[PDB]
Amino acid sequence: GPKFPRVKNWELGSITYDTLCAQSQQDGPCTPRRCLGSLVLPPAEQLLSQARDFINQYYSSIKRSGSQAHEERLQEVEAEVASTGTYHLRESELVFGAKQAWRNAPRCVGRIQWGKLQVFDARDCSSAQEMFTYICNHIKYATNRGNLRSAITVFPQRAPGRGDFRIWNSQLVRYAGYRQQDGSVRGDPANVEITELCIQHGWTPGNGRFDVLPLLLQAPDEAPELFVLPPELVLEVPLEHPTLEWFAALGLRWYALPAVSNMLLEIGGLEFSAAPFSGWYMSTEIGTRNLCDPHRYNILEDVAVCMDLDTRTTSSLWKDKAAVEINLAVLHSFQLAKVTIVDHHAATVSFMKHLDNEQKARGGCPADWAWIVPPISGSLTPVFHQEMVNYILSPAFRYQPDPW
Amino acid sequence: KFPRVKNWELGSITYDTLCAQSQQDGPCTPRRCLGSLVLPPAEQLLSQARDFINQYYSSIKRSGSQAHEERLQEVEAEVASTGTYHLRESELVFGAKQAWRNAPRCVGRIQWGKLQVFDARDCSSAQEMFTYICNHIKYATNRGNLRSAITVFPQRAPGRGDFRIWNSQLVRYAGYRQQDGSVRGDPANVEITELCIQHGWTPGNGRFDVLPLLLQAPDEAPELFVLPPELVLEVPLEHPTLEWFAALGLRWYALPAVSNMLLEIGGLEFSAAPFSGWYMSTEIGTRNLCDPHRYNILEDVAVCMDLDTRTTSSLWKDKAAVEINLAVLHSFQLAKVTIVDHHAATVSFMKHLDNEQKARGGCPADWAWIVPPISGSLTPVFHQEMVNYILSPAFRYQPDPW
Numbered sequence: 127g128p129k130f131p132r133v134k135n136w137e138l139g140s141i142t143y144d145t146l147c148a149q150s151q152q153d154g155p156c157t158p159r160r161c162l163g164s165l166v167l168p169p170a171e172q173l174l175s176q177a178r179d180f181i182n183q184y185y186s187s188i189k190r191s192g193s194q195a196h197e198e199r200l201q202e203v204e205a206e207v208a209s210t211g212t213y214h215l216r217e218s219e220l221v222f223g224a225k226q227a228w229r230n231a232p233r234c235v236g237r238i239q240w241g242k243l244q245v246f247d248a249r250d251c252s253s254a255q256e257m258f259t260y261i262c263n264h265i266k267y268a269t270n271r272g273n274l275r276s277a278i279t280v281f282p283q284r285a286p287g288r289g290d291f292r293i294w295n296s297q298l299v300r301y302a303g304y305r306q307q308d309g310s311v312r313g314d315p316a317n318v319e320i321t322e323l324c325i326q327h328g329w330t331p332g333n334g335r336f337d338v339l340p341l342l343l344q345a346p347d348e349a350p351e352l353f354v355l356p357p358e359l360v361l362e363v364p365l366e367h368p369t370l371e372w373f374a375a376l377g378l379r380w381y382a383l384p385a386v387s388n389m390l391l392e393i394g395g396l397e398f399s400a401a402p403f404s405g406w407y408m409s410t411e412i413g414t415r416n417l418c419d420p421h422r423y424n425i426l427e428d429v430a431v432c433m434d435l436d437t438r439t440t441s442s443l444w445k446d447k448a449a450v451e452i453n454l455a456v457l458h459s460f461q462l463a464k465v466t467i468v469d470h471h472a473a474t475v476s477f478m479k480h481l482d483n484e485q486k487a488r489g490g491c492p493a494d495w496a497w498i499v500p501p502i503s504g505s506l507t508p509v510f511h512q513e514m515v516n517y518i519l520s521p522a523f524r525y526q527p528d529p530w
Numbered sequence: 531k532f533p534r535v536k537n538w539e540l541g542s543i544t545y546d547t548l549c550a551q552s553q554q555d556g557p558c559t560p561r562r563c564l565g566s567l568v569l570p571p572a573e574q575l576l577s578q579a580r581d582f583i584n585q586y587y588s589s590i591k592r593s594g595s596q597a598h599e600e601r602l603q604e605v606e607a608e609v610a611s612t613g614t615y616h617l618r619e620s621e622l623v624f625g626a627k628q629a630w631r632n633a634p635r636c637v638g639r640i641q642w643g644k645l646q647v648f649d650a651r652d653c654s655s656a657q658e659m660f661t662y663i664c665n666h667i668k669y670a671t672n673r674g675n676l677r678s679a680i681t682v683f684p685q686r687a688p689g690r691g692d693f694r695i696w697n698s699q700l701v702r703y704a705g706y707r708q709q710d711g712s713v714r715g716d717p718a719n720v721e722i723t724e725l726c727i728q729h730g731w732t733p734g735n736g737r738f739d740v741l742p743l744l745l746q747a748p749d750e751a752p753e754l755f756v757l758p759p760e761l762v763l764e765v766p767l768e769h770p771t772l773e774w775f776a777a778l779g780l781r782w783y784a785l786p787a788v789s790n791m792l793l794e795i796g797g798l799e800f801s802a803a804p805f806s807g808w809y810m811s812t813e814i815g816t817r818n819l820c821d822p823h824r825y826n827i828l829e830d831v832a833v834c835m836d837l838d839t840r841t842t843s844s845l846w847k848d849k850a851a852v853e854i855n856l857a858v859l860h861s862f863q864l865a866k867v868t869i870v871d872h873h874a875a876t877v878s879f880m881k882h883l884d885n886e887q888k889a890r891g892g893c894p895a896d897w898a899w900i901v902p903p904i905s906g907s908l909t910p911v912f913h914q915e916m917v918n919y920i921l922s923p924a925f926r927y928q929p930d931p932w
């Protein structure tokens with residue numbers, strides 16, 4: 127074979143070679159001396175080359191590469207940068223770039239849907255209040271009464287010497303976490319800081335386990351402003367189990383819409399610091415991570431006690447049994463409420479199909495094995511047996527640290 | 531420089547300084563991570579030897595002593611004269627424990643200091659290899675109270691062919707290709723099964739037929755030896771509450787004993803150095819029995835359980851897999867054969883990480899192999915960042931001798 131990584135599937139015995147990785151223009155965290163693949167967090171000339179690359183990508187995607195229109199677009203970007211230090215994307219370039227950032231996201235198992243993204247252009251937005259309107263519109267469109275639709279809303283890009291548009295919440299919908307007297311947390315321990323920041327900015331807190339947080343929205347050079355989401359906009363699913371009738375009595379619930387709001391969207395060197403996007407859940411993120419992580423709702427022991435399991439010994443597999451029934455409750459309850467969700471089996475099957483599609487279309491697919499393999503039943507899914515190459519392509523979504 | 535390593539469940543952070551001791555490159559580069567891939571003169575030999583002898587004298591806290599100086603000179607003298615050298619038994623013992631300590635894919639490393647090392651470097655024939663292997667099996671098995679062991683056969687030499695065990699483990703079950711392209715037994719072992727038959731083995735026809743060994747002395751065809759049945763401890767699988775489970779006729783062998791890896795110590799290479807510990811239950815219950823390309827029993831079990839098999843969203847696979855893992859643990863516990871479940875194994879691995887942080891400043895670990903194949907995030911290792919790199923002494927994969 128060629129001098130590109132050989133990639134094997136150990137279940138089926140099949141082999142491919144990744145040639146797409148040659149397109150990577152940004153270094154990850156590994157060296158020949160040590161692999162850091164498991165870590166969670168790993169100028170005019172600089173901008174212009176990122177821009178040219180992106181414009182080349184766009185004209186390739188419309189098959190007008192080398193054309194007069196292509197060359198004129200490049201010259202227009204260069205002159206814009208020459209005189210202003212920055213440039214602006216055409217509407218169709220933004221749409222292409224946003225779908226490409228999703229396509230490029232190594233940690234996303236849902237990429238078979240990448241071409242079906244509704245891109246809302248909010249680059250005219252000039253205030254926190256207007257961000258709120260755009261965000262409520264996104265939530266209404268995306269939620270679609272339970273028939274969820276993938277979407278992204280793009281606020282204005284970072285600009286020379288002017289502050290950023292930022293949504294302070296890590297997602298559009300999250301539950302509060304309230305630090306208690308005895309040191310415990312009521313609600314979601316992941317959200318203790320943001321919850322405290324909201325109270326500080328004038329929110330009157332609740333006292334429940336599942337209280338929806340308000341949004342803290344920041345327009346350039348202003349303190350963030352607080353906006354409560356009208357409860358009729360936030361679709362939630364009370365959790366019940368198909369055969370364990372007591373499960374409904376636990377009063378657990380989750381919201382319908384997974385909407386990430388703290389990632390930076392980079393396209394051609396331009397940085398969109400507020401560009402919240404949403405899809406639909408894969409059930410394990412709720413049933414396994416949100417509900418069972420020891421540092422989250424941590425409900426395994428409660429549920430195992432209800433199931434009458436022996437929680438005194440590891441080898442009864444009480445944690446495994448309880449996690450499975452909680453995951454089944456999530457799926458059953460979303461299906462009952464007619465809210466789009468995908469189980470880990472169906473999601474990883476569709477990601478294997480996406481891998482094949484991309485092998486044909488671009489000669490590989492950047493993928494992060496530790497994130498793509500689900501957190502229960504790993505080797506029961508086809509992705510566990512599939513070698514994966516991880517690398518950074520642009521356009522991309524990047525993590526940004528909390529603005530506080 | 532030194533990477534920061536975070537645990538996301540507890541918020542705790544360490545810095546890995548051990549990785550600076552790596553002298554051998556892995557498959558990653560700044561352009562792309564290949565961490566998920568399964569497969570990767572006299573002066574170079576001399577410096578590996580020196581490093582190793584330095585490691586050894588450091589472990590017995592005699593660095594710089596007279597014995598240390600004179601041993602270094604012995605190695606130099608031997609290499610300069612002959613191109614190679616030989617380890618003393620106590621060095622071999624230290625080196626074997628260290629290759630285990632260093633193995634990034636092993637979750638069982640809390641046990642690394644406890645290893646019985648059989649010196650088989652005076653072995654000159656496949657016959658003698660067989661006797662040594664039978665003794666290792668008897669020792670390691672110990673009527674079910676398993677004891678970690680390694681037997682080390684003669685090192686590679688520039689002149690000649692290697693000592694090799696053709697089998698990938700000392701105990702494995704045959705896989706017989708059928709006329710309909712079906713496999714009876716373990717589909718992972720079709721090739722070795724067919725090799726045994728072509729070297730004169732009379733095959734069984736069951737699902738759990740223990741394979742004979744193909745053992746190879748230098749520059750000879752391999753020879754076939756059948757393991758005496760009484761040496762091979764097996765565990766019938768039954769379930770604590772599902773009565774019909776026992777009637778599936780399932781079983782697994784007690785002793786996991788890897789026989790195809792190369793042991794590298796101080797630049798010397800031991801191409802046959804089979805080692806054994808005890809099983810982590812998910813290896814049997816999840817991979818061997820539920821992999822689609824292995825015994826693939828999930829659907830049969832789920833149907834016996836009367837689960838709805840038609841749709842993924844009933845989580846019938848997840849349910850059946852849990853019960854199969856439970857059957858494995860219950861049955862080994864019942865037979866009084868050492869086994870460890872994935873929760874206990876991963877908790878002890880976390881302690882090993884803390885011990886190693888204190889002892890050496892880090893611990894090379896391969897997250898994709900450390901995290902178990904069921905209930906990943908239910909175990910503490912899922913939430914633990916890991917740094918992967920190659921330290922020597924080391925175990926290395928070697929391709930099949932045919």
Ligand code: HEM
Nearest residue numbers: 228231233234235236239276277403404405406407408523
């Ligand atoms: C259509 C349904 C979708 C499904 C089922 C899905 C599935 C997932 C899952 C399970 C994860 C891992 C999340 C975690 O553990 O934190 C993930 C990550 C991610 N997905 Fe998707 N995805 C979907 C849509 C989207 C969309 C619309 C975008 C953007 C346009 C997106 C981009 C990303 C990114 C950037 C990550 C990494 C997040 C991070 O680093 O925290 N995905 N996806």
Ligand code: HEM
Nearest residue numbers: 630633635636637638641678679805806807808809810925
């Ligand atoms: C004491 C009981 C032990 C337990 C519970 C244990 C656990 C494990 C597990 C679960 C794996 C992954 C197996 C797989 O998925 O193929 C593994 C791999 C490995 N272990 Fe251990 N281990 C034990 C003892 C040992 C010993 C005694 C040695 C050598 C002296 C050793 C060296 C290795 C090596 C080199 C690998 C990687 C094997 C490969 O690449 O195929 N371990 N261990």
Ligand SMILES: Cc1cc(N)nc(C[C@@H]2CNC[C@@H]2OCCNC[C@H](F)c2cccc(F)c2)c1
Nearest residue numbers: 166167236384385386403404405406407408525
């Ligand atoms: C520190 C840090 C880095 C990073 N890259 N990421 C994070 C968010 C963490 C990752 N793991 C839990 C939490 O992220 C929770 C949010 N995940 C929802 C998911 F991204 C999703 C699902 C379906 C559709 C869709 F559009 C989006 C934190």
Ligand SMILES: Cc1cc(N)nc(C[C@@H]2CNC[C@@H]2OCCNC[C@H](F)c2cccc(F)c2)c1
Nearest residue numbers: 568569786787788805806807808809810813927
């Ligand atoms: C191609 C290739 C490369 C590589 N490094 N490795 C392999 C063996 C594979 C790994 N995954 C299944 C199979 O290896 C099965 C052997 N595993 C037994 C396990 F290693 C074990 C457990 C407890 C104690 C002990 F001493 C040994 C194949």
Ligand SMILES: C[C@H](O)[C@H](O)[C@H]1CNc2nc(N)[nH]c(=O)c2N1
Nearest residue numbers: 164165166496497912913914915
């Ligand atoms: C340490 C490790 O990288 C970390 O816990 C990762 C593992 N895999 C994951 N996979 C997904 N999809 N989401 C996550 O939050 C994590 N956490």
Ligand SMILES: C[C@H](O)[C@H](O)[C@H]1CNc2nc(N)[nH]c(=O)c2N1
Nearest residue numbers: 510511512513566567568898899
């Ligand atoms: C492709 C992927 O690396 C491969 O399936 C790995 C993943 N993790 C593993 N983990 C262990 N312990 N054993 C294995 O064989 C594997 N296989």
Ligand SMILES: [Zn+2]
Nearest residue numbers: 156161558563
């Ligand atoms: Zn890597």
